[PDB]
Paper text:
To resolve which subunit(s) contained the substrate, we performed a refinement of the RuBisCO map without imposing any symmetry, leading to a second map at 3.8 Å resolution. As shown on Figure S3, we observed varied levels of density in all eight active sites: for one chain, the full RuBP density can be readily identified (chain G), whereas in two chains (A and E), no density is present at all. Finally, we observe partial substrate density in five chains (C, I, K, M, and O), which could correspond to one or two molecules of the reaction product, 3-phosphoglycerate, and/or a mix of states that are averaged out through alignment. This confirms the activity of the RuBisCO enzymes present in carboxysome, with various stages of the reaction cycle present within one different subunit of the same complex. While we do not think that there is specific cooperativity between the eight subunits of the complex, this might indicate some correlation in the catalytic reaction between subunits, perhaps regulated by interacting proteins such as CA and/or CSoS2. We also note that in the map obtained in the absence of symmetry, some unattributed, diffuse density at a lower contour level is present at the surface of the complex for one of the subunits. This suggests that, for some of the particles, other proteins are bound in this location. Nonetheless, this finding provides evidence that there are other proteins bound to RuBisCO, which likely originates from the broken carboxysomes. We note, nonetheless, that this density is not in the region of the complex where CsoS2 had previously been shown to bind, suggesting that either CsoS2 has multiple modes of interaction with RuBisCO or that this density corresponds to a different protein.
Carboxysomes are proteinaceous bacterial microcompartments that sequester the key enzymes for carbon fixation in cyanobacteria and some proteobacteria. Carboxysomes contain the enzymes ribulose-1,5-bisphosphate carboxylase/oxygenase (RuBisCO) and carbonic anhydrase (CA). CA catalyzes the conversion of cytosolic bicarbonate (HCO3−) into CO2, which is subsequently utilized by RuBisCO and fixed onto the 5-carbon sugar ribulose-1,5-bisphosphate (RuBP) as the first step in the Calvin-Benson-Bessham (CBB) cycle. RuBisCO is a hexadecameric complex, comprised of eight large subunits and eight small subunits.
Numbering used by the authors:
A (entry chain I), B (entry chain G): 11 to 328, 330 to 456
C (entry chain E): 11 to 188
D (entry chain K): 95 to 282
E (entry chain M): 189 to 282
F (entry chain J): 6 to 113
Amino acid sequence: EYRDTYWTPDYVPLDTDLLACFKCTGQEGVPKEEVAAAVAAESSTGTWSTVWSELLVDLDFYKGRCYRIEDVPGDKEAFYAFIAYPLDLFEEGSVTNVLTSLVGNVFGFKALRHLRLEDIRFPMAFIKTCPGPPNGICVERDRMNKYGRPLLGCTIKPKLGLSGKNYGRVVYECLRGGLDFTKDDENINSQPFQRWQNRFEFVAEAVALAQQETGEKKGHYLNCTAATPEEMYERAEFAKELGQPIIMHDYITGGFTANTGLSKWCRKNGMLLHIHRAMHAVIDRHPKHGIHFRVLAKCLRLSGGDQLHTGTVVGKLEDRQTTLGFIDQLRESFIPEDRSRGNFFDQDWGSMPGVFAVASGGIHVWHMPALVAIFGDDSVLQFGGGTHGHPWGSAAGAAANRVALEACVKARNAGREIEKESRDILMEAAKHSPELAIALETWKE
Amino acid sequence: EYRDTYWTPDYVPLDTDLLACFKCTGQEGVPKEEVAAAVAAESSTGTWSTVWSELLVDLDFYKGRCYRIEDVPGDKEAFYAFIAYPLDLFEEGSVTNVLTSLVGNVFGFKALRHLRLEDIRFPMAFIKTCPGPPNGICVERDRMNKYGRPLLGCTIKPKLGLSGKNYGRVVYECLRGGLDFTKDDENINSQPFQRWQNRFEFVAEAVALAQQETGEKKGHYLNCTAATPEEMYERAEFAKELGQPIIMHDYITGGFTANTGLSKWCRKNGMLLHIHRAMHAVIDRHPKHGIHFRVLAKCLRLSGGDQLHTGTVVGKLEDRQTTLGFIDQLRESFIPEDRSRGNFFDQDWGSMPGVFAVASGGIHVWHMPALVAIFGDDSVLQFGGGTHGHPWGSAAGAAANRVALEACVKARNAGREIEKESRDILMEAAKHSPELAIALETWKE
Amino acid sequence: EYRDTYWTPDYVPLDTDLLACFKCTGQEGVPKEEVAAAVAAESSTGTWSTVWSELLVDLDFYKGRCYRIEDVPGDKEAFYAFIAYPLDLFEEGSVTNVLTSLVGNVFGFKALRHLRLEDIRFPMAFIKTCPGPPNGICVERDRMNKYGRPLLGCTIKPKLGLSGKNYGRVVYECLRGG
Amino acid sequence: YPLDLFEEGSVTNVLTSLVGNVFGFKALRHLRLEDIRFPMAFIKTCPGPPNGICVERDRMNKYGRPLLGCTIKPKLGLSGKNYGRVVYECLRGGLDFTKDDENINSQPFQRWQNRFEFVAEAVALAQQETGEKKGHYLNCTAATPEEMYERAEFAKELGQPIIMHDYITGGFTANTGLSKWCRKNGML
Amino acid sequence: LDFTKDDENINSQPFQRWQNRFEFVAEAVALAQQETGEKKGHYLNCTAATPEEMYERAEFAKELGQPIIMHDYITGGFTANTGLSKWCRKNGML
Amino acid sequence: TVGDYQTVATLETFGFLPPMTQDEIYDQIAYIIAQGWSPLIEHVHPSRSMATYWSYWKLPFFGEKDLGVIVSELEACHRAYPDHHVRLVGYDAYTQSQGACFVVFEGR
Ligand SMILES: O=C(O)[C@@](O)(COP(=O)(O)O)[C@H](O)[C@H](O)COP(=O)(O)O
Ligand SMILES: [Mg+2]
Ligand SMILES: [Mg+2]
């Protein structure tokens, strides 16, 4: 057991294989080839021992081998490990099994100091078994009848404390000002001061009462995360009986099993699904530990959910090259390879619909000229206090955001540089909007 | 917006509040008072911003305050952040809600360079609303009629390749050899080369036949993990109608929602649960980032399960003081405050039965006497290649471990020191069993 | 509407395309690629007419194209028309859909006199979505514990006429005999 | 042939009994089944048409003229909203029926849950404009009988009057199961 | 008139199914109720050969909203009559 | 008065701005044709504004490269229906979406 049968420099991966990239840092002085083979062994099979039973199976077919060795540019002790795995190791249409198989054990092995999974080449045979998005981007736009602009969203503040009536009072004001989404926060599942059976029914009246007064279709994410799938599906059915168009779920804190369970429920019931990436900074934040959010983005797009947070936009998560690296994977059908944006594999989705890219985290009125030039129109903007922070109330603030973005896009199609003439497009729009005239004065500049 | 309102050194924590302990290191130059208050704010409210809706709520009730600041011994830039959270911001009986409220947002906060969660004081009021373990330790011991000795186990190898009949044949060898548990690998959910409906029915034949031959009751943790919650229950009931006593489920990747849903399913159906902690090294391995495994152990004991992986025993995780810390939280009824073992708070579980502490990671015969003294009798040992590495097959290996265990136990009750007298206890048991004689020779020393 | 748009002698089959083999002969005098294009057009899109609704769609992606023409051995008017189909045209995990899309309409055409479907190349993506055999040879042998020899069967005779108990009487004799 | 060799109400039984084996026999070079005289006692047990001509005319309030229909084109490519857009224009021009092509059962580019939903308004919007009842056959051909019943029931909940089915390839068993389902739910 | 009767001979004939008669009679009952300004009903004959087929016709009649039904007790059996009799009390028909 | 915001009914997009000038229409349609989309015209009475499908006028202008033609058919629908909206839509043929949907005339 000294490996190097997991290190095959001649193999060419099959088109049905699932490749991976591990930015691995090894022990001092050890040959770089040995550690990649060890990584391949502990993540696929964890063998050879000295066992009679290990001869009943021709293990040469099932063993995942490392086929290419590369070094991370600008650093010496680390390297890039490319490994090939057969398709037979994973259950069809299951995302929980692949995460457990790949990153489930190789992290715990003591011969590695820092390990990081970067990208996966999902084969079409595995993609076609996964459910994918329930609606997609184009079907969401067609159902909601909104074309040619990024959508609007807000987060209700305060998160904790408002009862059923006050919550409906607050959401009703934001909806009637120009917005079309309000987000039930992750903190709100079922509190003693405000039960879900009371929040669900009274947010239904506020959405329907302001919908007819504006003439547009509006929605409100209802937090349906629960401690048990039996209770969670109950909230889903109660939301259906009220006729709400869109719901919300926490996939990292709820498990991919429950996330897929909700994904297969919405498609049979024709609803739009929103996803919040809670706890994501535990695994993603540091550059040598954990799993890149891009891997989680691919796994989420395969699992389901029509809208996923990208964040964090204060002023931006950064780098822009990296964020667009996995934004294209959330929206396109085929994403070419690019090291500048970190696309290690030629990722093809075929005919799988895309997922909206949601930007949030405290956007104010002067961020609009830079927010649209990067995310495009297939995006959703969700403010924390941008709507509520208007001195005239939370209803007039919504018109200040709606007017600002519409001038922004209408300047974008005209061939102007929105990111460059921010003041020239914001001020001239304020000449036809008194609410924007004060909103631009408040959060200066 | 200047904070310092959350940092109240005069507040007295209540017996019903949820406490916490954070190891933090802020930006260069900032006072410890400000950064601790910011940590408390981003985990409780994320307020006060400029919002007009924030005056409709009595905010002082739902605010999380820091009442104590301690300095980390051996470090200068670090300190301990003790915070008390009111009981009214958490749903009764949900484990996914408390962690979402805790680690959902504060980890993305920019003003903190290092963050680690170490201790939580769960009040008895929230403990009483949680489902808890299905059977526990004493109920499992009563049901399976195993007293006075730790239980044994084995991991079936090879991980990939065995068919339905060969899997049961390998299982039948180990069960008839002396062991009383076998573990399905975490990769096995439902493979193309081995469907789960064939593995369930074939392993149901090996268990029953070896059950009567030896005269003992045996169990086999069946991997009931699935892509959807509906498929999980179907496998659970299919295993139930086959008469298997114990099942296996993966909590991190299956999600707390699904784990609790299966946890409340087992109590009515009389099934015992085995828990596998996959990819855990992402979070608990690094001492500056992530969550301590102690928090996960408490959350599991609150959520359910009767046995849990602790690992890793190669030759030990090290140091032993920390391992005995959360193990005391996994088994005991009352836990005092001890800084040496990391017991930062007085945690009382009331009358909830404990959970078995299962060691793993390639234990062999010579490690066995030292694994008995530290873990006690409420422990389970699992060998992946240790059992199957015996030259005389797969049943002779189990006989060697079973003989060695019982001699070690009987020498412990005789007042001898098992860990210091491993030799004088081990070679004397080899004169009554030739299988142990070759097992001791092949694995030296 | 003169075809040869479906006749792509340069197309390269993909790893997701579902290929087919057709042995065909058409009306006398037609060029060989013309009848191949005709076979290709109807089983995929049966187009182009003069319709405003036919421009709402990028119809160059969904078109099924015949890429290879080979001569049938022993015949002069017969040929092999190999045709490629994008995977987007069939429902995942359905065996009825492929037959309905393939031969549900093409056989009813007038310019083809003799058409024979010979082989189908199923792509792995479509294969992985189908249910397939429930147990298979290996699982059946494992459950029946019959190894190394072919299995023996028989048909009960007479087929029509036997009553309820006489049927069991006849079946028991065959089973107990070997 | 005697009547005792055939099952009551099972059209599949007469096929496998009559045509199942005779064609494979070696002593025949050319064979062709032309006509079969079905006895009345065997006819009576069969469900027959769920509505028939007279009931269809009575329910649709269309008399004295052969009905008109159209097939949606192109067969492949139209999204969910485009299908409804092209269905609505044909119905508002005078026709009373629009057809779903056999290729459209459930395609990746146009799911059946969206085809059913976006057809529901085109029929319902062009019906009120002309004052005439209009229909649109929704293809319920499925790989499993559980799915075909689901599609038929979903069509019923939408209030659609008529559906479509492929019996030659979809199986006489499935067609008969759907045929009896249509009678109890008042579907065409 | 306020009631019209379905005579006992009419249960389910090939020239007139029980599903077709129920739906077209339902339109006439409602269409005449609004014109006259008085509540009008029409007895529907729910006699069948099997007890569950009686219940299917009864529930189909309820879904169409007819208030009154008919049953033949001597030729239908006191068992079936009592089965429908207690069914009407929990459904509130005549 | 300040600060009291009255609920205003806009149709879908570009509602919150005053009506576009003639030159704004010019570069908007220039962009929509430069993207390779297909211009499409719709019109309804203000009562049936919420309806899923509007009325074509007359057909989607597939493959039109001249800017002097569409700017002549926008007013024909308005003069023919002086009490109707004039919606201008961009048909995305490749992805079956609509990248631009803004109403030109509010309706006299
Ligand atoms: O490395 C070893 O020493 C073994 O392979 C045994 O070798 P032998 O067969 O030579 O004894 C260990 O069992 C595995 O590493 C982990 O054990 P498990 O998979 O059981 O958890
Ligand atoms: Mg938030
Ligand atoms: Mg393992």
